[PDB]
Write a sequence for this structure.
């Protein structure tokens, strides 16, 4: 009953992970691989309106460093979200496999995180759960931001001091702190604040003191100081991160945060390829795609666009 409608469009493969369950699947019409997030409506209970909030936010996010939503299917018992499959896995596992990244490789990945987070802020949202388990590598080894635990709104080791304390906060300021923890982990391969006891970890985060390894450059140390300020008002703004001297080193252009993935411009080749599968004319097809209902038509159009981009 629950998988019947989904199986009209996708061939299901194995479970990837569990939190929600995620399955690898293949979109039948295009042959493109997708990740399907499966949520039980009864299990969610009082949390169900929050899932509807995440979905509406993702529908408003379309960006080169954000995992793409293709299709939302709701049945009597489940909500299925069909998403971009990132075959490279988690940044969390990548850092561990490499031990730590050089300053140069850290900058390659950090500029992608900055691009995604600045865009999220430009759209009027805050992520609030930035961490390496929420950053995945796509087939081109580029990063895609996800939010697996429904924190984004219009994990303790990465949480800002004010967020933990239950004080009022600005999501953008909490994101900058979390980005500072990510910058440290990328270059060190361990957390700046860590403890086996939750209370002692809480004390360490509130204090804001951390070891500075000998391999960190003076410029890296300065950027870390600018992001990891216990006082949220003393933290660097996102605007100043885009063209920060450390960020610009070896690039000489600020982070390109604007989206390259449009809602308005339709790709003529993909509209043509999609139109052959429907009994309607081309203009009726274009009008329907432009409604962005996140039904099978939306999924087919976006997957054809991904298939085109590979070529
Ligand atoms: C090959 O080995 C591997 C190994 C690991 C992963 C993969 N691949 C792979 N690709 C795709 C997924 C996926 C993407 C998005 C969402 C999601 O929930 N989006 C919602 C969302 O992104 N909102 C949002 C984004 C930005 C701003 C605001 C809101 C859920 C799942 C996946 O999941 C597996 C989980 C397992 C638990 N840790 C996290 C990943 N895995 C592959």
């Amino acid at each position: 009953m629950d998988y019947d409608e989904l199986l009209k469009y996708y061939e299901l493969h194995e479970t990837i992970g569990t939190g929600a369950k995620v399955k690898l699947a293949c979109h039948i019409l295009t042959g493109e691989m997708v990740a399907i997030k499966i949520m039980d409506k009864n299990t969610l209970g009082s949390d169900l309106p929050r899932i509807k909030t995440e979905i509406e936010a993702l529908k408003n996010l379309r960006h080169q460093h954000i995992c793409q939503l293709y299709h939302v299917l709701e049945t009597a018992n489940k909500i299925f979200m069909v998403l971009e499959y990132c075959p490279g896995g988690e940044l969390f596992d990548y850092i561990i496999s490499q031990d730590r990244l050089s300053e140069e490789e850290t900058r390659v990945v950090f500029r992608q995180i900055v691009s995604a987070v600045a865009y999220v802020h430009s759209q009027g949202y805050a992520h609030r759960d930035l961490k390496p388990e929420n950053l995945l590598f796509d087939e081109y080894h580029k990063l895609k931001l996800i939010d697996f635990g429904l924190c984004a709104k219009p994990s303790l080791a990465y949480a800002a001091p004010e967020l933990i304390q239950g004080k009022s906060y600005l999501g953008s300021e909490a994101d900058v702190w979390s980005m500072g923890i990510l910058l440290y982990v990328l270059m060190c391969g361990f957390l700046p604040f860590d403890d086996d006891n939750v209370m002692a970890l809480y004390k360490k985060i509130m204090r804001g003191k951390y070891d500075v390894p000998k391999w960190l450059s003076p410029s890296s140390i300065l950027l870390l100081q600018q992001m990891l300020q216990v006082d949220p008002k003393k933290r660097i703004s996102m605007k100043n991160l885009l063209n920060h001297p450390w960020i610009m080193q070896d690039y000489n252009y600020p982070v390109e945060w604007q989206s390259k993935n449009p809602f308005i411009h339709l790709d003529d080749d993909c509209v043509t390829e999609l139109s052959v599968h429907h009994r309607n004319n081309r203009q009726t097809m274009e009008d329907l795609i432009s409604l962005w209902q996140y039904d099978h038509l939306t999924a087919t159009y976006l997957l054809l666009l991904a298939k085109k981009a590979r070529g």
Observations:
- The first helix runs from residue 41 to 44.
